Design a binder for this molecule. Structure first.
Ligand SMILES: [Mg+2]
Ligand SMILES: [Mg+2]
Ligand SMILES: [Mg+2]
Ligand SMILES: [Mg+2]
Ligand SMILES: [Mg+2]
Ligand SMILES: [Mg+2]
Ligand SMILES: [Mg+2]
Ligand SMILES: [Mg+2]
Ligand SMILES: [Mg+2]
Ligand SMILES: [Mg+2]
Ligand SMILES: [Mg+2]
Ligand SMILES: [Mg+2]
Ligand SMILES: [Mg+2]
Ligand SMILES: [Mg+2]
Ligand SMILES: [Mg+2]
Ligand SMILES: [Mg+2]
Ligand SMILES: [Mg+2]
Ligand SMILES: [Mg+2]
Ligand SMILES: [Mg+2]
Ligand SMILES: [Mg+2]
Ligand SMILES: [Mg+2]
Ligand SMILES: [Mg+2]
Ligand SMILES: [Mg+2]
Ligand SMILES: [Mg+2]
Ligand SMILES: [Mg+2]
Ligand SMILES: [Mg+2]
Ligand SMILES: [Mg+2]
Ligand SMILES: [Mg+2]
Ligand SMILES: [Mg+2]
Ligand SMILES: [Mg+2]
Ligand SMILES: [Mg+2]
Ligand SMILES: [Mg+2]
Ligand SMILES: [Mg+2]
Ligand SMILES: [Mg+2]
Ligand SMILES: [Mg+2]
Lengths: 131, 94, 65, 273, 86
RNA sequence: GAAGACUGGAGUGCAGAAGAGGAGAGUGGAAUUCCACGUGUAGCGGUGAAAUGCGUAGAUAUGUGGAGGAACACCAGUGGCGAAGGCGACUCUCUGGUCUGUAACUGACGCUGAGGCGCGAAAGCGUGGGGAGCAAACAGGAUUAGAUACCCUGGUAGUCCACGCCGUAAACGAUGAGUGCUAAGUGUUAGGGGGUUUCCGCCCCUUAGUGCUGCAGCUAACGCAUUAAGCACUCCGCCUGGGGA
């Protein structure tokens, strides 16, 4: 059965990148909103829209490629799996690809990236690595 | 509740007076049991495709039933195999 | 080439209908293969239950000389 | 069923017995009892003619109906009882007359059933009919050999014979031993198998249990003296130092056929066992 | 279980006059089925394929009873006293 | 964690469908063997060649009848059903599961699952039956330097049935179960919808199975490839050089 809806978000984007698909849509959730919204802030995804329906709504994401078809996202990874959750202190927040990537952290002040977390001295659950 | 359909063959060397004696007899034994008969029809003399017993032809009969306990077909089956007048019989449900 | 029972709208095959079944066996009483008669897969199964039922009541022969 | 006993002692170790689940009542019908006296194999003259008999629990005779000639009266099974005088059980039947009599209990005969005899009886377990009215293939028992005499051929527990054909005045029967025999068509029989099938599975377990049934010990002929048995004598254990093993009276005992060669019923026996 | 026999049990345990999928209704129908297979299995002793279907009813019936106990205890104790369960 | 709310999971209801799924009772036709009786004369059978064997006490062949047991010709199909083992003559009785359509109903009631409990080809074991063909052991004839083998003539347990054990297999797709995503082309099984047409028929779409070919991806290679050995999450089982073992 479905045991990790966040992992599906991470892997659906990865599966669409390989075949250069220009868009995708998937069932919506509150936590997926920030993750999808965060990616738009650093240009990892070209756009995002919400569709309201009966069950839970629907979200579609517009993937982004450079001129002459280079991927903008070269990898997505899930860290804190349901089988082994991980937590990071204020000084333990990593730097994905030596600052050229980002990490999504679910702090007590909201879901925000690794760079912003070290500016507020808070920790939380590390959710994903995007580079 | 559940309907059946019985075909049985009577020996060819039988006479009209005694042929209808067994047709009314086998129609009877389906009645005191839990069944109500619908249609007793006879095709007539036919040539058997193979020599089933010492005979070569036979009279064909058709019976329709609406049975519930499904034991009136058991009594027919029990007494059809034992009489010397019926040479074959078959019960079909649809 | 064309299924007989589907084209004619037949939905039930009876074992008392000897004249219909005689078109679906060979000269020796053997059931013809489906690639020869052209009948569909669904009604090939119903057809053989009719033939096997009628063989027992001596309406069709088992093996014919 | 068959009841195994726990090995409490060395005599109860291998012993089994019936549980008597089919038996309904434990008291016999008083007006159908006759006395028996043991004979221990003693002759008309007082001589011991048949050996290894004598000295068991005392019994009483229950008069059985083997003729079954009460035709047209519906007989209702009342009880199923125990008979010391035979291996099968018996059933008490009281007719609509008021008369009562015992018959052999067939397999599947239960209390409350109705039993018929005659010519209009149906082919059901327990009914009695002439062999000419019995269809080919049925399993029968209690076959009689002469009309009006009474059942005699198949009667012990678990035994059965099968009707096999017709020859005009006679009927072919395959007896329990495996013999094909010709019997008149006016002789009667009962439909079914005989009652107590498990009787052959009982392990006696004790020597005293054989003694309870009236069996005295059997001495082998190899441990006798030369004037007692053709096998006695010799120093130590001795083999059968003869051409063939011998009975206590001569007359070879292994493979030698003892049926009369000029018998009058060889023309009524179609094939032997 | 014949179709009309089932619809009497459904009508006898509905929490309201329309439902057919209430846990009270399903357990009552499931109970009637395993009290009908137990006679078939008792006489057809060596019918192993049918006996597997029995054990999937018992397990399914147990799952629904557990769910009812947690959600609403008062309803749960009413069913077992009415269906004669433990 | 607690209190509520929902319907995309799961299950019930309603309308259809297919199937060698299972247990019990009864019946059918070809064919082999044996037995009885007509006709008939000198071989039959067998092999790479032969011989043992059967036959003038009259065989093989042939016509008629009787007894008995086991397997079900054509249909028959990378067709169907089942959790696996496995299930193929026909009828009835008792029973399990699955698929499609509807959106009436409950409202997360779910997945995996160590120990535990059941099922489980064939051979084998115990008790009681049955025994036609086949056939370990065994006997005889050939082959061979030898032949405790292959080949030929016979043949006992066994194979069949009821009940009770045994608990293994190259029990294999050599591929654990659940869930979601990721080009296409084409057969076939069971359904549903629409267009043409009076039907038939053709075409398109769709659900659940069953085959083949192939992209990205994976792989040491062979190869797998929407029925993954690709991309991911949950739970269980197992491995750490060979022999000894
Ligand atoms: Mg003696
Ligand atoms: Mg002795
Ligand atoms: Mg001495
Ligand atoms: Mg002497
Ligand atoms: Mg001596
Ligand atoms: Mg001595
Ligand atoms: Mg000595
Ligand atoms: Mg649903
Ligand atoms: Mg079936
Ligand atoms: Mg079956
Ligand atoms: Mg034959
Ligand atoms: Mg040579
Ligand atoms: Mg001959
Ligand atoms: Mg399956
Ligand atoms: Mg069912
Ligand atoms: Mg079914
Ligand atoms: Mg299916
Ligand atoms: Mg609601
Ligand atoms: Mg499970
Ligand atoms: Mg275990
Ligand atoms: Mg075996
Ligand atoms: Mg055995
Ligand atoms: Mg034996
Ligand atoms: Mg040799
Ligand atoms: Mg042989
Ligand atoms: Mg067994
Ligand atoms: Mg081993
Ligand atoms: Mg193993
Ligand atoms: Mg296999
Ligand atoms: Mg393995
Ligand atoms: Mg998997
Ligand atoms: Mg999958
Ligand atoms: Mg497919
Ligand atoms: Mg080592
Ligand atoms: Mg080692």
């Amino acid at each position: 059965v479905m045991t990790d809806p966040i992992a599906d978000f991470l892997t659906r984007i990865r599966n669409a990148n390989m075949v250069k698909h220009d868009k995708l849509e998937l069932p919506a959730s509150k936590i997926k909103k920030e993750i999808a919204e965060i990616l738009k802030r650093e240009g990892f995804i070209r756009d995002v829209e919400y569709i309201e329906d009966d069950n839970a709504g629907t979200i579609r994401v517009f993937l982004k490629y450079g001129a002459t078809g280079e991927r903008v996202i070269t990898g997505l990874k899930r860290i804190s799996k349901p089988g082994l959750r991980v937590y990071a202190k204020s000084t333990e927040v990593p730097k994905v690809l030596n600052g050229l990537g980002i990490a999504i952290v679910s702090t007590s002040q909201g879901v925000l990236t690794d760079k912003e977390a070290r500016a507020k001295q808070v920790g939380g659950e590390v959710l994903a690595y995007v580079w | 509740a559940r309907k059946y359909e019985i075909m049985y063959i009577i020996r060819p060397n039988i006479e009209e007076d005694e042929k209808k004696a067994v047709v009314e007899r086998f129609d009877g034994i389906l009645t005191e049991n839990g069944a109500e008969i619908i249609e007793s029809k006879e095709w007539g003399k036919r040539r058997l495709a193979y020599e089933i017993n010492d005979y070569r032809d036979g009279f064909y009969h058709i019976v329709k039933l609406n049975a519930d306990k499904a034991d009136s077909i058991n009594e027919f089956d029990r007494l059809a195999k034992i009489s010397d007048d019926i040479v074959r019989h078959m019960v079909i449900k649809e | 080439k064309v299924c007989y029972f589907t084209s004619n709208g037949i939905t039930h095959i009876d074992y008392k209908d000897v004249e219909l079944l005689k078109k679906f066996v060979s000269e020796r009483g053997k059931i013809l293969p489906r690639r020869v008669t052209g009948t569909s897969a669904k009604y090939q199964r119903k057809l053989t239950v009719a033939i096997k039922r009628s063989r027992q009541m001596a309406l069709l022969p088992f093996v014919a000389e | 069923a068959i009841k195994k006993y726990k090995p409490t002692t060395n005599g109860r170790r291998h012993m089994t017995s019936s549980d008597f689940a089919e038996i309904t009542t434990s008291t016999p019908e008083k007006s159908l009892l006759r006395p028996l006296k043991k004979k221990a194999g003693r002759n008309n003259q007082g001589k011991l003619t048949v050996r290894h008999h004598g000295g068991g629990h005392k019994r009483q005779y229950r008069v059985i109906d083997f003729k079954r000639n009460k035709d047209g009266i519906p007989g209702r099974v009342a009880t199923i009882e125990y008979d010391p005088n035979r291996s099968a059980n018996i059933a008490l039947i009281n007719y609509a007359d008021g008369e009562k009599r015992y018959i052999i209990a067939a397999k599947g005969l239960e209390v409350g059933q109705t039993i018929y005899s005659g010519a209009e009886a149906d082919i059901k377990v327990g009914n009695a009919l002439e062999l000419k009215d019995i269809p080919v293939g049925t399993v029968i028992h209690n076959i009689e050999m002469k009309p009006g005499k009474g059942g005699q051929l198949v009667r012990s527990a678990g035994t059965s014979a099968q009707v096999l054909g017709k020859e005009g005045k006679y009927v072919l029967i395959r007896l329990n031993s495996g013999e094909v025999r010709m019997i008149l068509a006016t002789c009667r029989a009962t439909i079914g198998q005989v009652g107590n099938e498990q009787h052959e599975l009982i392990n006696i377990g004790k020597a005293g249990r054989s003694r309870w049934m009236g069996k005295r010990p059997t001495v082998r002929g190899s441990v006798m003296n030369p004037n007692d048995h053709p096998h006695g004598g010799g120093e130590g254990k001795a083999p059968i130092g003869r051409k063939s093993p011998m009975s206590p009276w001569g007359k070879p005992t292994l493979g030698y056929k003892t049926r009369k060669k000029n018998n009058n019923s060889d023309k009524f026996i179609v094939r032997r066992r | 279980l014949t179709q009309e026999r089932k619809n009497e049990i459904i009508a006898e345990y509905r929490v309201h006059d329309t439902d057919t999928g209430s846990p009270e209704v399903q357990i009552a129908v499931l109970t009637a089925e395993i009290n009908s297979l137990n006679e078939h299995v008792r006489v057809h002793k060596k019918d192993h394929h049918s006996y597997r279907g029995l054990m999937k009813m018992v397990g399914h019936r147990r799952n629904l009873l557990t769910y009812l106990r947690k959600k609403d205890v008062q309803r749960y104790r009413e069913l077992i006293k009415r269906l004669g369960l433990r």
